[PDB]
Copies of this chain bind each other. A is one copy, B any other.
């Protein structure tokens, strides 16, 4: 890995403030909302960064960090990420499903594929045998591919049969999640959890940009449109 339990601190601390202020913004905003549908969109979307803040704080305060022996060392693995992402990604996926109006069957498949992507990714992070950490990465990425597939050629189709304001916001969000989401298995692979090419200092800066984007950025695009009505 890339030994780091203090230099990344600034990024952990900044991600804490951003997620923290991101929650605050969505909070002091859905406040007016009377429409039960928009009400659901603000609920899901506000909860995403709210969970992100607590876990980002845990990593900053040191709780979210653990040490796992693999290779020929003891590696600094921030597990709070998996704790965050486990509820955050299925919540993000529900916004997309509600927006486009997906079947209860597909929403269950997606949440299921997602829980598996995060749990499997968690087992990979905590696995002591260097070689095996890549098997789980393979299985985790495979599930993401399954998820990004229906989001693309599946939700897109169900979108075009909705009001244009809705068809387009989804278009924008769809692109943002498919692009952002696929960066995690890459950062993970080259980062301190896989082939230690990139230092934890950097891995943490990357995850931060992606997180704030995948949640607050995403939330902004959504919450600031009439598609949620």
Contact = CB atoms under 8 A, between A and B. Distances in A.
Given A47-B109, A50-B116, A116-B50, A129 B61 contact: yes
Contact of A43 (B46, B61, B62, B106): B106
Nearest to A124: B63
B112 A39 contact: no
A72 interface: no
Contacts of A119: 54
A95 to B, nearest CB: 11
A36 B105 contact: yes
A112 B23 CA distance: 13
Number of copies of this kind of chain in the complex:
3
Contact of A105 (B40, B87, B139): B40
B61 A105 contact: no
B40 A104 contact: yes
Interface in A64-105: 87, 103-105
A42 interface: yes
A192 interface: no
A165 B36 CA distance: 26
Contact of A109 (B46, B62, B116, B132): B46
A183 interface: no
A123 interface: yes
B61 A135 contact: yes
Given A47-B112, A132-B61, A106 B54 contact: no
A87 B41 CA distance: 24
A212 interface: no
A103 B54 contact: no
Interface of A: 36-37, 39-44, 46-47, 50-51, 54, 57-58, 61-63, 87, 103-106, 108-109, 112, 115-116, 119-120, 123, 126-127, 129, 132, 135, 139
24 contacts: A36-B104, A36-B105, A39-B103, A39-B105, A39-B106, A40-B103, A40-B104, A40-B105, A41-B105, A43-B105, A43-B106, A46-B109, A47-B108, A50-B116, A54-B119, A57-B135, A61-B127, A61-B129, A61-B132, A62-B129, A63-B123, A63-B127, A63-B132, A87-B115
